Predict the structure.
Amino acid sequence: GMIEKVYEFKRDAKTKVVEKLVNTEHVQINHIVLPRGEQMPKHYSNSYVHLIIIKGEMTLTLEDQEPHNYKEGNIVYVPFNVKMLIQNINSDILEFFVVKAPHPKKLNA
Amino acid sequence: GMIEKVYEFKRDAKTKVVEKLVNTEHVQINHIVLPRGEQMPKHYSNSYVHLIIIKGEMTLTLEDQEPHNYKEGNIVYVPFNVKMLIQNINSDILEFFVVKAPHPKKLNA
Ligand SMILES: [Cl-]
Ligand SMILES: [Cl-]
């Protein structure tokens, strides 16, 4: 076989997509598409998070803060153990990657 | 200040861009744009690598393998301590993120 491992993420999605693609000892990488009016579950981050926004606008509410908007061209860091909500209110299509390191299991102890 | 930390990456770049944006205890995230005919330095990966390709086509040569081509919509894993070369031969503009975890310093011991 090859040295590398390949994953594919959906291009030009126009529907809600939650792709939990990479899940290794060292990292998790997900690909998310949220059409306008959709949102992800409210939850506390289970690792250190970076949100790589490649299309549209995200409305991110953390803890007791007012909602903050981030557009394509932003990478947003959310610390471990922080209450978060991701919504797409303001764009036709919001597309981002979620990078988590280390794997949540490493922080569960 | 805010709970989150924000970074910006260059959108719609048409020139060579090597943006070493995120560099934390836990992760590194870079944003790279290679116009046609450009390439990155040949080197051995200093952590576990994932290449998130969002535009164009990458020609990736690992160790003694023939060059392999990967297009937009691929995430490519390259293990730690592997000789690699990234080239853009076949597309006008190749754009990818590089996710590295854990931080290289953690593997340097
Ligand atoms: Cl990994
Ligand atoms: Cl981090």
Summary: Chain A is about 0% helix and 55% strand. The domain at 1-109 of chain A is CATH 2.60.120.10 (Jelly Rolls). Chain A has one domain: 1-109. Chain A touches chain B through 39 residues (CB under 8 Å).
